[PDB]
Amino acid sequence: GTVPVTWRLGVDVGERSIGLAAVSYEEDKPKEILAAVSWIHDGGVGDERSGASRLALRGMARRARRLRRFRRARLRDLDMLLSELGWTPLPDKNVSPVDAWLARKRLAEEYVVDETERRRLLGYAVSHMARHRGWRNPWTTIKDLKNLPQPSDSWERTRESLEARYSVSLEPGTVGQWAGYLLQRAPGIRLNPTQQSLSNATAFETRLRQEDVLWELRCIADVQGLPEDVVSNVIDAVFCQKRPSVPAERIGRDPLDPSQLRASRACLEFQEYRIVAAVANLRIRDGSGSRPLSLEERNAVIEALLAQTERSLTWSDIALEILKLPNESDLTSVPEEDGPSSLAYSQFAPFDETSARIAEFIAKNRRKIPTFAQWWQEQDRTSRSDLVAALADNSIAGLLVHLPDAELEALEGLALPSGRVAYSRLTLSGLTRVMRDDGVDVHNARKTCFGVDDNWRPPLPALHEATGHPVVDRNLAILRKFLSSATMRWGPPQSIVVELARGASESRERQAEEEAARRAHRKANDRIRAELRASGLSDPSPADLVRARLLELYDCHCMYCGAPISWENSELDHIVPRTDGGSNRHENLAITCGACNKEKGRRPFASWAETSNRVQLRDVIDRVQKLKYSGNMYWTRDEFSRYKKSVVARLKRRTSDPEVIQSIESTGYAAVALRDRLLSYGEKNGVAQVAVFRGGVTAEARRWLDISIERLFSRVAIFAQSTSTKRLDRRHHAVDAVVLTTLTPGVAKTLADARSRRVSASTEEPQSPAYRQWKESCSGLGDLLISTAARDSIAVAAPLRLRPTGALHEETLRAFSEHTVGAAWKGAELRRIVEPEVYAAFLALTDPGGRFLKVSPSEDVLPADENRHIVLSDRVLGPRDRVKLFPDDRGSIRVRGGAAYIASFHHARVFRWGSSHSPSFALLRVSLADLAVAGLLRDGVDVFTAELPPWTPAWRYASIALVKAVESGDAKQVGWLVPGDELDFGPEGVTTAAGDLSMFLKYFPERHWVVTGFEDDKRINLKPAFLSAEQAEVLRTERSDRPDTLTEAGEILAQFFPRCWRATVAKVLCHPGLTVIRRTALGQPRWRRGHLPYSWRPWSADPWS
RNA sequence: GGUAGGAUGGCAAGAUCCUGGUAUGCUGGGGAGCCUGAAAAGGCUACCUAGCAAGACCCCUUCGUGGGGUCGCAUUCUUCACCCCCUCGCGCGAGGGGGUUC
DNA sequence: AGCTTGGTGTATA
DNA sequence: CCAGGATCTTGCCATCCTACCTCT
DNA sequence: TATACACCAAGCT
Ligand SMILES: [Mg+2]
Ligand SMILES: [Mg+2]
Ligand SMILES: [Mg+2]
Ligand SMILES: [Mg+2]
Ligand SMILES: [Mg+2]
Ligand SMILES: [Mg+2]
Ligand SMILES: [Mg+2]
Ligand SMILES: [Mg+2]
Ligand SMILES: [Mg+2]
Ligand SMILES: [Mg+2]
């Protein structure tokens, strides 16, 4: 029964959270909080230690599978070529460990007269070379690999280092020659640097290159006299590689023409569009005001801009010799940031970049492409545009000219500007046609060419369609469930309010220094772009620019060990590892030899330098601190100082603490994407407005409504001085959403001005009619929120993960143990029997009328019966026969000939037995490996109730009391628990606390707890629902920096978190009135039993039907 | 005007994936050197080789516990049930995507 | 002889 | 780690559109 | 505006 009410929706997006409020209004006064809920989500992250999202881990695993499958196919095709040549591939076994290396060495060194020996060594060498071929730019062809210098400079430096280290000069000094020589001279030497945790020097230090392996192949071919066609076939088989590709479904669509893909920046239509649009936005002085350029002025400037081979027309040049303006400042509306010494008029106007690159490539390589040079001078702009589009879109996964194949290879080697622009090629051609004909700008050209009005906006995505961004998708899924539920409860909202991750309350000095930072960044990047384009890099990436900057800043030396480095052997090490949240911000990037990076791994700089011998921590710190500010460089003075401090702080960390930087891109994207989808919902549902306000407006509105989280939720003081922030209670997201429902644009401007004035600095109330009206309308909001928190209606819930997907086991395969049948059997050895038939036979041997195994790990269950025979259904194992066992007394499954421990528990099944006045409880912890080996990872299976065989790790490592009670027939399954199920202990709270939980519950009497795991057969891990771990972690952080600022409650919280309540199942489920609460999207517990997970009481839940 | 939102282009700083690779690592099979040993078998350091989620679907084939091909760790209430949407698109049982109020 | 803490291994760059 | 493609965020400059808000 | 779990061992009642 839907009852319609006037209500507003408040949306607080977050990185790992979203606050959602449905607040019913009357006039502009809030009448009732219909629903306030903080939903805690994972941001797409499944494993916090891995750091990466589930989508990212799946993509990496899928691409590892794809790489290995194509490697299989490539090596099989090489085997076929070797069999056609008569060359014997290296066998799988019964060969010397250095047979391939010595074959490579001997074939490089001397001609082998015996044809049989020559073919065998050639096949050994080539098959091994294909297995270990080194690295190539994946976008380069095999012909491009052949055109590289041979060997690479990395291998020449390695060769010089090896000759100096070993006092011998091998000729010609190939990788195979040096490796075979060193594997014989120093047995047990490691070839490449590896991840560290005795430590001897490796043979090589830098990454092996495919041109080095190719040069060794050429040397072997020249020494052995192989025919050139044979060498060519072997090269194309060894260095075969799939070209990287872009799926076209990953490319966005033109908003005006959704059937068309967005155009590449390489397109000549986009180049023409850029020039014409920029000229259409310039203004000329007219009677102390600005006027648009006339049609003739526009055509003159546009023809001067298009007719360019190099970017040499500045805005001052355009004003002075092209426009014939009497003064340089007469040209107004220049699209550049204003700076000193007339920088805006010193900046370059756009040009046809693709035509300039193609003309440069033609004039440089007229020998290689004379037919293409003639065709390019022959054809017109439309045919050139079609050719350029084909050349720029050839990289799509899914030429009209009969060009010679060498010329086609040269053009595919030609580099064009990358990146997609907003419009399609057809749209750009039409829009540019309208502006060049009518003299209009982009807006009027869009109106004319596409028949739209001044109110036109691009089409927005709907609520049901995702972005592919994990944080945004989590926020969107939660919001759309909330909105669907709230719409069927109370109708559509009157208005929707969304908070955007933007901030404007900044000082003029802050604005000036950020402007100077942007100016210095642009000047340095333009310069470094110029020398990199002179060096041979067409379109430098941000990481290219960072690499050039750090190579200039450290004089082409490693930042860690000081070894000399170059462009191709350097690595950009994340000082804070990516798996520990480490960002790509340039203070987190260190230029590194590569050996230092590979040895450092995930370990922090200090925890690696402390025990290492290659680098010195203090030497690295002093080299960073000894950097001096030049006259002109990338950073400003303040930026250079803060950059050195950030780098030093990143080197100094001795623990795997997460990244210092709190990135807000995902929050901003979530806010903008959810706003676009809420605008779509409002168009489809007649919502009057979807307003947006900044975060600081919401914080200032909380300040001026006297909404304190510690007062609202009666949270005790954690600091001796001042009050705790909003983040101590996780309900603050829902509070922020409620506050967001009150905001109007005028009061938002007033509170933004007020907060900006207080940053630029007790206190003074804001002064505006909108502030007065909003304050009088939302005077009662404080009392309403106090009553809502008093009746505990603001819920904190995590969405459940019920799908049985993810990692089936741990990634480390383990060797099996062995145990003889006739020997004495302990309980743990009986629990570790791999084969289910042998396990069941031994189970029946220990207890005949039995389905489960009832043992203790330390008890000697069976004696050393010297004539014991285990009779399977396909074999009889005598007392001498050896039974395969899992290596450890923990849950594990057989995977690919080895043993793998089970992964995290998917769920726990709750079993209750005993009398009704005092029942006994136990958990059956079920992993995805249990479901996999039980065959339950299939269609039509309820994973929480489907039976698990006794040989599964779940039933093997259940508690002995649970096993005896299930076998005796008294224990029945009454429910299930997943990580994230809320345990509401009731108004009485937790009554079985002892030791540390009692001391935590004196100051934080939490009745709502979240299941986080099941750490053994008798325990469940619970953390409080309403309390944040980041607040406790920053308590621990500020405790070191400040003297005893934490209160008793602050210290108690700081030591309770993060392990929290490692609780006993018997001591948790013994609380009467404890409820396992599963909530609807509005934060309301699901009590009616339907086809969605519902709340249940472990005391009174019936056994499963 | 002032604030806010949106378009396009530029510039700056970032975030998320996607495609293709490399070098290790683990397990199985090996073994170059060293050591402990030998009437008495295993280590250590490397290197070689195969596999690297369990598995699923398709086609083989000059028949087999194999060969080849495409996939499989995302979309957090699994499965079931109901309702909605796009697509197997004749008012279809279906392939995906969404929602289910306490 | 059971619960409470403490430490640590887990596939990587 | 490597190259390099796609999607997007935030801030500033230029232009165009929208909406409301505030003081003479 | 964010980020460990399942196993293995001590430890004082
Ligand atoms: Mg917020
Ligand atoms: Mg490969
Ligand atoms: Mg290789
Ligand atoms: Mg090596
Ligand atoms: Mg690193
Ligand atoms: Mg929030
Ligand atoms: Mg290997
Ligand atoms: Mg090896
Ligand atoms: Mg496989
Ligand atoms: Mg579902």
PDB file of all heavy atoms in Angstrom, chain A residues 1046-1065:
ATOM      1  N   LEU A1046      44.538  11.483  24.227  1.00  0.00           N
ATOM      2  CA  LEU A1046      43.468  10.502  24.221  1.00  0.00           C
ATOM      3  C   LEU A1046      42.912  10.364  25.634  1.00  0.00           C
ATOM      4  O   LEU A1046      43.665  10.362  26.611  1.00  0.00           O
ATOM      5  CB  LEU A1046      43.986   9.139  23.772  1.00  0.00           C
ATOM      6  CG  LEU A1046      44.657   8.934  22.409  1.00  0.00           C
ATOM      7  CD1 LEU A1046      45.021   7.466  22.157  1.00  0.00           C
ATOM      8  CD2 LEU A1046      44.051   9.624  21.230  1.00  0.00           C
ATOM      9  N   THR A1047      41.596  10.239  25.749  1.00  0.00           N
ATOM     10  CA  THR A1047      41.000   9.956  27.048  1.00  0.00           C
ATOM     11  C   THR A1047      41.144   8.474  27.356  1.00  0.00           C
ATOM     12  O   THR A1047      41.779   7.712  26.620  1.00  0.00           O
ATOM     13  CB  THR A1047      39.524  10.347  27.105  1.00  0.00           C
ATOM     14  OG1 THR A1047      38.758   9.485  26.255  1.00  0.00           O
ATOM     15  CG2 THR A1047      39.306  11.770  26.733  1.00  0.00           C
ATOM     16  N   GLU A1048      40.527   8.056  28.464  1.00  0.00           N
ATOM     17  CA  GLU A1048      40.453   6.638  28.778  1.00  0.00           C
ATOM     18  C   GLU A1048      39.648   5.916  27.712  1.00  0.00           C
ATOM     19  O   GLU A1048      40.043   4.840  27.253  1.00  0.00           O
ATOM     20  CB  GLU A1048      39.838   6.428  30.159  1.00  0.00           C
ATOM     21  CG  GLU A1048      40.415   5.241  30.893  1.00  0.00           C
ATOM     22  CD  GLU A1048      39.983   5.183  32.343  1.00  0.00           C
ATOM     23  OE1 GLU A1048      39.040   5.915  32.708  1.00  0.00           O
ATOM     24  OE2 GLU A1048      40.586   4.406  33.113  1.00  0.00           O
ATOM     25  N   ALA A1049      38.539   6.528  27.280  1.00  0.00           N
ATOM     26  CA  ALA A1049      37.737   5.983  26.192  1.00  0.00           C
ATOM     27  C   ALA A1049      38.519   5.945  24.890  1.00  0.00           C
ATOM     28  O   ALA A1049      38.370   5.004  24.102  1.00  0.00           O
ATOM     29  CB  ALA A1049      36.463   6.808  26.023  1.00  0.00           C
ATOM     30  N   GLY A1050      39.359   6.955  24.651  1.00  0.00           N
ATOM     31  CA  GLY A1050      40.171   6.964  23.447  1.00  0.00           C
ATOM     32  C   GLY A1050      41.198   5.848  23.420  1.00  0.00           C
ATOM     33  O   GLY A1050      41.358   5.173  22.399  1.00  0.00           O
ATOM     34  N   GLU A1051      41.903   5.634  24.540  1.00  0.00           N
ATOM     35  CA  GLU A1051      42.840   4.513  24.619  1.00  0.00           C
ATOM     36  C   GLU A1051      42.122   3.172  24.521  1.00  0.00           C
ATOM     37  O   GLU A1051      42.621   2.244  23.873  1.00  0.00           O
ATOM     38  CB  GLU A1051      43.660   4.568  25.911  1.00  0.00           C
ATOM     39  CG  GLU A1051      44.389   5.860  26.186  1.00  0.00           C
ATOM     40  CD  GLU A1051      45.659   5.997  25.376  1.00  0.00           C
ATOM     41  OE1 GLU A1051      46.177   4.966  24.901  1.00  0.00           O
ATOM     42  OE2 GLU A1051      46.159   7.132  25.233  1.00  0.00           O
ATOM     43  N   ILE A1052      40.944   3.058  25.138  1.00  0.00           N
ATOM     44  CA  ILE A1052      40.214   1.797  25.121  1.00  0.00           C
ATOM     45  C   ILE A1052      39.728   1.468  23.712  1.00  0.00           C
ATOM     46  O   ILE A1052      39.838   0.321  23.258  1.00  0.00           O
ATOM     47  CB  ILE A1052      39.066   1.869  26.145  1.00  0.00           C
ATOM     48  CG1 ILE A1052      39.590   1.627  27.561  1.00  0.00           C
ATOM     49  CG2 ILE A1052      37.962   0.909  25.823  1.00  0.00           C
ATOM     50  CD1 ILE A1052      38.694   2.180  28.628  1.00  0.00           C
ATOM     51  N   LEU A1053      39.254   2.478  22.977  1.00  0.00           N
ATOM     52  CA  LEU A1053      38.879   2.285  21.581  1.00  0.00           C
ATOM     53  C   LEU A1053      40.094   1.943  20.721  1.00  0.00           C
ATOM     54  O   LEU A1053      40.026   1.053  19.857  1.00  0.00           O
ATOM     55  CB  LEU A1053      38.164   3.536  21.069  1.00  0.00           C
ATOM     56  CG  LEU A1053      37.580   3.536  19.661  1.00  0.00           C
ATOM     57  CD1 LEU A1053      36.419   2.582  19.608  1.00  0.00           C
ATOM     58  CD2 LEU A1053      37.102   4.921  19.298  1.00  0.00           C
ATOM     59  N   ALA A1054      41.218   2.635  20.956  1.00  0.00           N
ATOM     60  CA  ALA A1054      42.424   2.441  20.157  1.00  0.00           C
ATOM     61  C   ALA A1054      43.041   1.061  20.353  1.00  0.00           C
ATOM     62  O   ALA A1054      43.679   0.540  19.432  1.00  0.00           O
ATOM     63  CB  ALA A1054      43.443   3.525  20.498  1.00  0.00           C
ATOM     64  N   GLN A1055      42.887   0.461  21.536  1.00  0.00           N
ATOM     65  CA  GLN A1055      43.335  -0.918  21.711  1.00  0.00           C
ATOM     66  C   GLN A1055      42.271  -1.963  21.392  1.00  0.00           C
ATOM     67  O   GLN A1055      42.632  -3.116  21.131  1.00  0.00           O
ATOM     68  CB  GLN A1055      43.917  -1.181  23.110  1.00  0.00           C
ATOM     69  CG  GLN A1055      45.315  -0.580  23.357  1.00  0.00           C
ATOM     70  CD  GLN A1055      45.371   0.925  23.451  1.00  0.00           C
ATOM     71  OE1 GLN A1055      46.040   1.587  22.659  1.00  0.00           O
ATOM     72  NE2 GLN A1055      44.761   1.464  24.491  1.00  0.00           N
ATOM     73  N   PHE A1056      40.982  -1.618  21.438  1.00  0.00           N
ATOM     74  CA  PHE A1056      39.963  -2.563  20.992  1.00  0.00           C
ATOM     75  C   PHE A1056      40.061  -2.793  19.492  1.00  0.00           C
ATOM     76  O   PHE A1056      40.033  -3.936  19.027  1.00  0.00           O
ATOM     77  CB  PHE A1056      38.572  -2.061  21.360  1.00  0.00           C
ATOM     78  CG  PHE A1056      37.489  -3.081  21.158  1.00  0.00           C
ATOM     79  CD1 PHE A1056      37.431  -4.211  21.949  1.00  0.00           C
ATOM     80  CD2 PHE A1056      36.531  -2.911  20.171  1.00  0.00           C
ATOM     81  CE1 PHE A1056      36.439  -5.149  21.767  1.00  0.00           C
ATOM     82  CE2 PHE A1056      35.532  -3.843  19.990  1.00  0.00           C
ATOM     83  CZ  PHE A1056      35.488  -4.964  20.789  1.00  0.00           C
ATOM     84  N   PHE A1057      40.176  -1.724  18.725  1.00  0.00           N
ATOM     85  CA  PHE A1057      40.313  -1.897  17.289  1.00  0.00           C
ATOM     86  C   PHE A1057      41.762  -2.241  16.930  1.00  0.00           C
ATOM     87  O   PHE A1057      42.688  -1.866  17.652  1.00  0.00           O
ATOM     88  CB  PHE A1057      39.864  -0.625  16.576  1.00  0.00           C
ATOM     89  CG  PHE A1057      38.379  -0.532  16.393  1.00  0.00           C
ATOM     90  CD1 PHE A1057      37.546  -0.239  17.460  1.00  0.00           C
ATOM     91  CD2 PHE A1057      37.816  -0.745  15.148  1.00  0.00           C
ATOM     92  CE1 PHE A1057      36.180  -0.164  17.285  1.00  0.00           C
ATOM     93  CE2 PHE A1057      36.454  -0.667  14.968  1.00  0.00           C
ATOM     94  CZ  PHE A1057      35.639  -0.373  16.035  1.00  0.00           C
ATOM     95  N   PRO A1058      42.001  -2.964  15.812  1.00  0.00           N
ATOM     96  CA  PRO A1058      41.064  -3.482  14.803  1.00  0.00           C
ATOM     97  C   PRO A1058      40.617  -4.926  15.013  1.00  0.00           C
ATOM     98  O   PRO A1058      39.727  -5.383  14.302  1.00  0.00           O
ATOM     99  CB  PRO A1058      41.864  -3.324  13.504  1.00  0.00           C
ATOM    100  CG  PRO A1058      43.324  -3.431  13.917  1.00  0.00           C
ATOM    101  CD  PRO A1058      43.396  -3.230  15.419  1.00  0.00           C
ATOM    102  N   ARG A1059      41.191  -5.661  15.969  1.00  0.00           N
ATOM    103  CA  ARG A1059      40.822  -7.062  16.142  1.00  0.00           C
ATOM    104  C   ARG A1059      39.435  -7.218  16.746  1.00  0.00           C
ATOM    105  O   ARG A1059      38.747  -8.199  16.440  1.00  0.00           O
ATOM    106  CB  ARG A1059      41.868  -7.778  16.988  1.00  0.00           C
ATOM    107  CG  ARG A1059      43.240  -7.780  16.343  1.00  0.00           C
ATOM    108  CD  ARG A1059      44.102  -8.865  16.926  1.00  0.00           C
ATOM    109  NE  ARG A1059      43.774 -10.163  16.355  1.00  0.00           N
ATOM    110  CZ  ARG A1059      44.654 -11.132  16.156  1.00  0.00           C
ATOM    111  NH1 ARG A1059      45.931 -10.978  16.464  1.00  0.00           N
ATOM    112  NH2 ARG A1059      44.242 -12.286  15.640  1.00  0.00           N
ATOM    113  N   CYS A1060      39.017  -6.264  17.575  1.00  0.00           N
ATOM    114  CA  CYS A1060      37.655  -6.109  18.128  1.00  0.00           C
ATOM    115  C   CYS A1060      37.308  -7.368  18.930  1.00  0.00           C
ATOM    116  O   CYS A1060      38.160  -7.883  19.667  1.00  0.00           O
ATOM    117  CB  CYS A1060      36.686  -5.753  17.018  1.00  0.00           C
ATOM    118  SG  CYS A1060      37.099  -4.224  16.147  1.00  0.00           S
ATOM    119  N   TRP A1061      36.092  -7.889  18.810  1.00  0.00           N
ATOM    120  CA  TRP A1061      35.590  -8.956  19.673  1.00  0.00           C
ATOM    121  C   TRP A1061      35.785 -10.288  18.952  1.00  0.00           C
ATOM    122  O   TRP A1061      34.941 -10.728  18.174  1.00  0.00           O
ATOM    123  CB  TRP A1061      34.127  -8.707  20.028  1.00  0.00           C
ATOM    124  CG  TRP A1061      33.543  -9.645  21.046  1.00  0.00           C
ATOM    125  CD1 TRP A1061      34.216 -10.502  21.865  1.00  0.00           C
ATOM    126  CD2 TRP A1061      32.154  -9.819  21.341  1.00  0.00           C
ATOM    127  NE1 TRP A1061      33.334 -11.192  22.654  1.00  0.00           N
ATOM    128  CE2 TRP A1061      32.059 -10.799  22.344  1.00  0.00           C
ATOM    129  CE3 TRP A1061      30.983  -9.238  20.856  1.00  0.00           C
ATOM    130  CZ2 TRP A1061      30.842 -11.207  22.870  1.00  0.00           C
ATOM    131  CZ3 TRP A1061      29.780  -9.647  21.374  1.00  0.00           C
ATOM    132  CH2 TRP A1061      29.716 -10.623  22.370  1.00  0.00           C
ATOM    133  N   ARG A1062      36.912 -10.934  19.224  1.00  0.00           N
ATOM    134  CA  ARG A1062      37.163 -12.304  18.783  1.00  0.00           C
ATOM    135  C   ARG A1062      36.381 -13.205  19.725  1.00  0.00           C
ATOM    136  O   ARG A1062      36.895 -13.691  20.731  1.00  0.00           O
ATOM    137  CB  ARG A1062      38.655 -12.599  18.794  1.00  0.00           C
ATOM    138  CG  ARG A1062      39.473 -11.501  18.142  1.00  0.00           C
ATOM    139  CD  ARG A1062      40.946 -11.675  18.403  1.00  0.00           C
ATOM    140  NE  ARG A1062      41.414 -12.999  18.013  1.00  0.00           N
ATOM    141  CZ  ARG A1062      42.647 -13.441  18.206  1.00  0.00           C
ATOM    142  NH1 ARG A1062      43.570 -12.683  18.770  1.00  0.00           N
ATOM    143  NH2 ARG A1062      42.962 -14.670  17.818  1.00  0.00           N
ATOM    144  N   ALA A1063      35.115 -13.429  19.391  1.00  0.00           N
ATOM    145  CA  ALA A1063      34.109 -13.907  20.320  1.00  0.00           C
ATOM    146  C   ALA A1063      33.884 -15.403  20.209  1.00  0.00           C
ATOM    147  O   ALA A1063      34.043 -15.987  19.145  1.00  0.00           O
ATOM    148  CB  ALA A1063      32.799 -13.204  20.018  1.00  0.00           C
ATOM    149  N   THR A1064      33.424 -16.002  21.299  1.00  0.00           N
ATOM    150  CA  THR A1064      33.055 -17.408  21.304  1.00  0.00           C
ATOM    151  C   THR A1064      31.606 -17.556  20.856  1.00  0.00           C
ATOM    152  O   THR A1064      30.747 -16.763  21.252  1.00  0.00           O
ATOM    153  CB  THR A1064      33.257 -17.991  22.709  1.00  0.00           C
ATOM    154  OG1 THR A1064      34.631 -17.855  23.085  1.00  0.00           O
ATOM    155  CG2 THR A1064      32.887 -19.462  22.771  1.00  0.00           C
ATOM    156  N   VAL A1065      31.353 -18.544  19.986  1.00  0.00           N
ATOM    157  CA  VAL A1065      30.005 -18.794  19.473  1.00  0.00           C
ATOM    158  C   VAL A1065      29.070 -19.172  20.613  1.00  0.00           C
ATOM    159  O   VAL A1065      27.911 -18.734  20.665  1.00  0.00           O
ATOM    160  CB  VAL A1065      30.049 -19.878  18.378  1.00  0.00           C
ATOM    161  CG1 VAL A1065      28.654 -20.264  17.902  1.00  0.00           C
ATOM    162  CG2 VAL A1065      30.866 -19.389  17.210  1.00  0.00           C
TER     163      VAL A1065
END
